[PDB]
Design a protein around this ligand. Structure first.
Ligand SMILES: Nc1nc2c(ncn2[C@@H]2O[C@H](COP(=O)(O)OP(=O)(O)NP(=O)(O)O)[C@@H](O)[C@H]2O)c(=O)[nH]1
Ligand SMILES: Nc1nc2c(ncn2[C@@H]2O[C@H](COP(=O)(O)OP(=O)(O)NP(=O)(O)O)[C@@H](O)[C@H]2O)c(=O)[nH]1
Ligand SMILES: [Mn+2]
Ligand SMILES: [Mn+2]
Ligand SMILES: [Mn+2]
Ligand SMILES: [Mn+2]
Lengths: 371, 370
């Protein structure tokens, strides 16, 4: 037990007490691999990452386009985990987020100090966030090569560095709302994504379609579990990961979301541009400031890792400092600044939840168009 | 059209020295290869306003090529692109490989233009000719009659992916390579007229840069009035926007400068017009109304009608664009001075390619030449 002060999710705290081993015990699953690779014709390469090479293909049966994620070698339990998470998310008959909202089943952390973080706004309607999770269609393993592969639905994506600069204010609102729906759903299912970033969000702009992909670092949330902090990707890592506060939760994803948002709105990519793991924290504290950083360390009685003792003292950078004529069409309103400010907080408990964020004034033009 | 006339500061008389067989592209007969069988087209590598571009292979040599399939345009435009490409590749002794002759370089001898001569200049031979894309063939399928240009292949990555990865020294390197290319084509009496990132192919692993897309390029002729509907919006110089038609090679240095400002200050594009009209607005919002008006007066330019809803703007100092996201590129006096001397309303005031190459900012690159 690394952590000194313990922490629990503010919301969806007890999903994996409600659900049992058959849902979350991925280690003790048996993967029924399809031997028949002849069902799929692999065509061009569509991307790559730390854990795979990804190709677009065709299911010969139906001629439907698919993608095939050819998995690099990793521990077998990591493959079981990705598959179990994907199947849990796609196979849920009645997604919790489509049911009527129950405040008292939602805000489940009843510590007096955590309840002061409940926002006076919240998105309290059913929504289709489950439809923004990528669908896993098949799991294949060549009998010769023995390469495991995941077959997904295909999304017609453009690199974020090409697409995002083209997006209007309203379009950013739209897509980031879609992403929040996806996160509200997976969190409602007791799952943390743990790698929210642009390359893990596929957008087919002509079909106004968004899919949250790459569930290979996702985990099930268990109360007071200490997780590995070497997850997510550098620029999107929350302060909890960097200071080795292991008892984190779904709120990690909201920091990552917030960093994506700040980059889009302020047109600084990435927003927190660490040149190393150590420097990632420096880049964050250079904005949010040493004062609130210290208060956060004190709140959780965090022993700061050794590497961070060469950090200088930094005064907070007000968000308005990042506004300029190149981005004022996106950044020049009080709503977006308040939204970003309420996502990017050292203390993971202080951060907006996905539902709270969805209820924020900035998304009003999007919510107005729902009905 | 123009009231005050203007001539290039340098390389002014190239196309008086060279004759019709060099610059008269209208009166060329293009010998199209009709076979097509020589080339196997593979995947698409890009597109533009004038083409769809595919990579492929020359079957005999197995060499990788690109094939630029030309969209319909006036036949003289195709003759022009080809003539410029062949002029540039076929020059036996590129002028820029010869010893520098100051007297043959600074050819505009007006007293007021001579004060723009910089106290620094790159005065050495260089290999800028090797940074021009090589045209290998010209083919036309007899069935579709689609004209196409076959080039060398460059293994390029989108600038929006690549440029953010580049170090200060690497930007210095590549932008020096680009200046060599422009010095060469200018020395050959050719204006590129569409300098922008999508027209600059970079194979970063091979530290290789090629200036491509010569389809809007033209031959420079003294006091010729050119179409101003050239280049691409974000890179258009003020001369194009105010319809000052008697422009020259210095147009390319504005475009170069806008590319550089975007890389250095990490604002892409640097001058982000939402329309032709607004493009000028975005420029004047930086450089300021005062110098804009002095420029109009210098050339007695009748400002086009569309620009009379412009407000009054005070110049934005360059240091205003420096921030913690870009200070590793922008935080020295050299780069600020270089940018300042490229992005000038008055085309005559701008650094030439050779002057830019001699600038203090490129010192670390020049130090590594010998
Ligand atoms: N066009 C398209 N590209 C895809 C699709 N799915 C994945 N990709 C591409 O393949 C990349 C890698 O897929 P991903 O599942 O993130 O693999 P990973 O190896 O786990 N990546 P990471 O390093 O972030 O952990 C994506 O970032 C994307 O560029 C898709 O449906 N369409
Ligand atoms: N990878 C690669 N791509 C190329 C190469 N040559 C051209 N392209 C791609 O094809 C695009 C179009 O080529 P270009 O000759 O600029 O065509 P154009 O129709 O005249 N474009 P514009 O609209 O700028 O006038 C380039 O911007 C680039 O993306 C090459 O050698 N390698
Ligand atoms: Mn990924
Ligand atoms: Mn992954
Ligand atoms: Mn082009
Ligand atoms: Mn062109």
């Amino acid at each position: 037990m690394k952590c000194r002060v313990w922490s629990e999710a503010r919301v969806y705290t007890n999903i994996n007490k409600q659900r049992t081993e058959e849902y979350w015990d991925y280690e003790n699953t048996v993967i029924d691999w399809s031997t028949n690779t002849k069902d799929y014709e692999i065509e061009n390469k569509v991307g790559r990452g730390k854990y795979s090479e990804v190709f677009q293909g065709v299911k010969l049966d139906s001629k439907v386009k698919i993608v095939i994620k050819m998995l690099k070698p990793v521990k077998k339990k990591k493959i079981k985990r990705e598959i179990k998470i994907l199947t849990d998310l796609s196979n849920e008959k009645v997604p919790p987020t489509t049911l009527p909202f129950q405040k008292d089943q939602y805000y489940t952390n009843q510590k007096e100090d955590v309840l002061k973080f409940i926002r006076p706004y919240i998105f309290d309607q059913p929504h289709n966030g489950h439809a923004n999770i990528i669908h896993l269609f098949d799991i294949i393993k060549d009998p010769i090569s023995k390469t495991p592969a995941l077959v997904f639905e295909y999304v017609d994506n453009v690199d974020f560095r090409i697409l995002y600069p083209k997006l209007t204010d309203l379009e950013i609102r739209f897509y980031m709302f879609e992403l929040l729906k996806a996160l509200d759903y997976c969190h409602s299912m007791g799952i943390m994504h743990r790698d929210v970033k642009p390359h893990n969000v596929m957008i087919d702009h002509k079909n106004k379609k968004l899919r949250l992909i790459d569930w290979g670092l996702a985990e099930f949330y268990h109360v007071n579990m200490e997780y590995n902090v070497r997850v997510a990707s550098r620029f999107f890592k929350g302060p909890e990961l960097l200071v080795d506060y292991r008892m984190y939760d779904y709120s990690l994803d909201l920091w990552s979301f917030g960093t994506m948002l700040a980059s889009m709105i302020f047109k600084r990519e990435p927003f927190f541009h660490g040149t190393s793991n150590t420097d990632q924290l420096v880049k964050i504290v250079k904005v949010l400031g040493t004062s609130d950083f210290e208060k956060y360390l004190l709140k959780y009685e965090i022993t700061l890792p050794r590497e961070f003792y060469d950090m200088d003292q930094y005064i907070r950078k007000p968000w308005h400092r990042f506004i300029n004529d190149g981005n004022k069409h996106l950044s020049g309103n009080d709503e977006i600044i308040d939204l970003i400010d309420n996502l990017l907080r050292y203390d993971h408990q202080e951060r907006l939840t996905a539902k709270e964020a969805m209820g924020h004034p900035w998304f009003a033009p999007i919510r107005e168009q729902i009905e």
